[PDB]
Amino acid sequence: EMEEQFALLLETLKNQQMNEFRELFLALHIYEQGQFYQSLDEKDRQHLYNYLSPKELADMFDVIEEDNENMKDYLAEMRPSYAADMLAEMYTDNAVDLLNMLDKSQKAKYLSLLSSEEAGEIKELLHYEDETAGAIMTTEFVSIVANQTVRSAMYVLKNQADMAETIYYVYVVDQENHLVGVISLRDLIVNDDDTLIADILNERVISVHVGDDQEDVAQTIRDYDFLAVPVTDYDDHLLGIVTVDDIIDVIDDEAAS
Amino acid sequence: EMEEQFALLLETLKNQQMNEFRELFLALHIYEQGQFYQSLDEKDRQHLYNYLSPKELADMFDVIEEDNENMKDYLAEMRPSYAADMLAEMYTDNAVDLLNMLDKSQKAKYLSLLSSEEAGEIKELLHYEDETAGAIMTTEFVSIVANQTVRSAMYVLKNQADMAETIYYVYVVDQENHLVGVISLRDLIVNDDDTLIADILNERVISVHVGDDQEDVAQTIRDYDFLAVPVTDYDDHLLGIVTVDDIIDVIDDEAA
């Protein structure tokens, strides 16, 4: 089981077998990657930073509990530049959370190490009040325009949607980024290449307001059985999405409360 | 906003304009369909049974919360054959849940009114002890074999879209139906149509056992952030899937 695999992994790590390590580590689901990593002593963590790129390390951090508390120093032991690149690769919702956990000093220092484009989304979402949709949503969603074909929509997905949180829902917006429709991937794939998105999209797209209370958001997810839900401002501008995996954590919090 | 839509609907009922009703009703998400239905009296409800086919009504009952002390009455007030056909169209996990909320007699009643095939999976999952994986899983999952092209896989996916519980995780089983791997529709979409499933499938497949406690299943879905999780027996035979939307109800239950 888990034990066996981790043991082999620890050995490739010590013997500094970079490629063997990478193959094994990267074969693990990001949650298992997190457990393995959270078991390592400070020495082995360092080696690990040498065999994984900031993007790869970010995939794992996305799921490590930011309240862990051993944060601060996980990031501290990292070369500031490396940490910053890693924060810039995590999903925005997770990045914002990490930052709000570090001491007020670290937060600005790491944030300072990022370019304008790298910190852009992180800076917007930091503004949202804790426990509101804006505070638990993320920016990596897929949006397209109506007067496009499925062939065209499907091209974005295949060659231009690697950064997206999820592609299982495709949101349709107009030029001003107004949310005007939605189409699930499962409805999309069964349509002809030439069909126009505008002809098969759903006009009754359900969304929440960026200032709504997480509990209300959770209720929407609970009622509609959605794996994600779009977030907008009063003007209906698509700002982000809240995913079911995070809502579960929210639900866990409300209960324990 | 929602109160208005419902008004235009209730109106098509008092007017008995089947076509107009169906176009407005079927435009709603099944949850809103459920609320509309649940706010009707005996007679508009009856009208609804006339304007909706069993599988259409099933699409809605799938999300109607059993334990609602009305199922007994909802099913009772509708034509036996109609109600039976509606059970056969609901997703298996939900059909089993509804049946177990009905009087031992009624359960037998509708059960007997179903063909061997219509009731197959229903009767299989009916024997699973309450609160175990088997008791909260469903059978409408998509499985494929490792030695085929992505194109072949996609072909199967499109055909299952309409019936499967979900097509976002595709399970790979062997000739004997042993769970050997898994691949997400997302990975399929970004791979070349020529690529062989066996070359891109994930070997480390996470699963749970039919007898596992729902709480443990809930924990697994919580940690791995899964939309669904496969269920097997001790011999690794893929028996079904437990989806995230249902695990949330489990979690609500486990809480207070």
Ligand SMILES: [Mg+2]
């Ligand atoms: Mg977190």
Ligand SMILES: [Mg+2]
């Ligand atoms: Mg947050």
Ligand SMILES: [Mg+2]
């Ligand atoms: Mg639900």
Ligand SMILES: [Mg+2]
């Ligand atoms: Mg959505």
Ligand SMILES: [Mg+2]
């Ligand atoms: Mg998230």
Ligand SMILES: [Mg+2]
């Ligand atoms: Mg139910």
Ligand SMILES: [Mg+2]
């Ligand atoms: Mg229990």
Ligand SMILES: [Mg+2]
């Ligand atoms: Mg059940």
Ligand SMILES: [Mg+2]
């Ligand atoms: Mg989780």
Ligand SMILES: [Mg+2]
């Ligand atoms: Mg279900």
